[PDB]
Design a protein around this motif. Sequence first.
Motif, mmCIF file in Angstrom:
data_model
loop_
_atom_site.group_PDB
_atom_site.id
_atom_site.type_symbol
_atom_site.label_atom_id
_atom_site.label_comp_id
_atom_site.label_asym_id
_atom_site.label_seq_id
_atom_site.Cartn_x
_atom_site.Cartn_y
_atom_site.Cartn_z
ATOM 1 N N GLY A 1 -4.751 -6.912 -9.537
ATOM 2 C CA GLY A 1 -3.704 -5.970 -9.189
ATOM 3 C C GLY A 1 -3.619 -5.720 -7.696
ATOM 4 N N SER A 2 -4.310 -4.684 -7.232
ATOM 5 C CA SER A 2 -4.305 -4.336 -5.816
ATOM 6 C C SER A 2 -4.519 -5.575 -4.952
ATOM 7 N N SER A 3 -3.879 -5.594 -3.787
ATOM 8 C CA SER A 3 -3.994 -6.721 -2.869
ATOM 9 C C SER A 3 -3.344 -6.399 -1.527
ATOM 10 N N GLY A 4 -3.776 -7.099 -0.483
ATOM 11 C CA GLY A 4 -3.227 -6.872 0.841
ATOM 12 C C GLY A 4 -3.852 -7.771 1.889
ATOM 13 N N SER A 5 -3.046 -8.658 2.464
ATOM 14 C CA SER A 5 -3.528 -9.583 3.483
ATOM 15 C C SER A 5 -4.296 -8.839 4.572
ATOM 16 N N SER A 6 -4.999 -9.592 5.410
ATOM 17 C CA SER A 6 -5.780 -9.006 6.493
ATOM 18 C C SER A 6 -4.868 -8.404 7.557
ATOM 19 N N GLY A 7 -5.192 -7.188 7.988
ATOM 20 C CA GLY A 7 -4.392 -6.522 8.999
ATOM 21 C C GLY A 7 -4.173 -5.055 8.690
ATOM 22 N N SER A 8 -3.009 -4.538 9.071
ATOM 23 C CA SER A 8 -2.681 -3.138 8.836
ATOM 24 C C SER A 8 -3.642 -2.221 9.584
ATOM 25 N N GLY A 9 -3.981 -2.603 10.812
ATOM 26 C CA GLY A 9 -4.891 -1.805 11.614
ATOM 27 C C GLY A 9 -4.424 -0.371 11.766
ATOM 28 N N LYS A 10 -5.232 0.444 12.433
ATOM 29 C CA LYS A 10 -4.898 1.848 12.648
ATOM 30 C C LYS A 10 -3.420 2.009 12.989
ATOM 31 N N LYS A 11 -2.668 2.605 12.070
ATOM 32 C CA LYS A 11 -1.241 2.823 12.274
ATOM 33 C C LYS A 11 -0.988 4.161 12.963
ATOM 34 N N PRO A 12 0.138 4.251 13.688
ATOM 35 C CA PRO A 12 0.522 5.469 14.406
ATOM 36 C C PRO A 12 0.923 6.597 13.462
ATOM 37 N N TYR A 13 2.211 6.666 13.145
ATOM 38 C CA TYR A 13 2.724 7.699 12.253
ATOM 39 C C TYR A 13 2.965 7.140 10.854
ATOM 40 N N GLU A 14 3.356 8.016 9.933
ATOM 41 C CA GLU A 14 3.619 7.610 8.557
ATOM 42 C C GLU A 14 4.580 8.582 7.878
ATOM 43 N N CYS A 15 5.744 8.076 7.485
ATOM 44 C CA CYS A 15 6.752 8.898 6.825
ATOM 45 C C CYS A 15 6.207 9.487 5.527
ATOM 46 N N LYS A 16 7.032 10.281 4.853
ATOM 47 C CA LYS A 16 6.636 10.907 3.597
ATOM 48 C C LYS A 16 7.401 10.302 2.423
ATOM 49 N N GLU A 17 8.643 9.900 2.676
ATOM 50 C CA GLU A 17 9.478 9.304 1.640
ATOM 51 C C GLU A 17 9.255 7.797 1.560
ATOM 52 N N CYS A 18 9.694 7.084 2.592
ATOM 53 C CA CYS A 18 9.544 5.635 2.640
ATOM 54 C C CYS A 18 8.157 5.248 3.145
#
Length: 46
Positions: A1-18
């Motif tokens: 099930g769960s999965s995600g390529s390498s990356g997605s480092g420390k992100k800045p902001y993050e919306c609530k809806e999208c």
Amino acid sequence: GSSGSSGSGKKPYECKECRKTFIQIGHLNQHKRVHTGERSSGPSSG
Ligand SMILES: [Zn+2]
């Protein structure tokens, strides 16, 4: 099930809806607003 390529480092902001991030606070300052309403418009709707 769960999965995600390498990356997605420390992100800045993050919306609530999208749950979308933003490199600059400006791009979000406006976007955040775009999320005024238009909620619960999925089922039994067009
Ligand atoms: Zn959003």
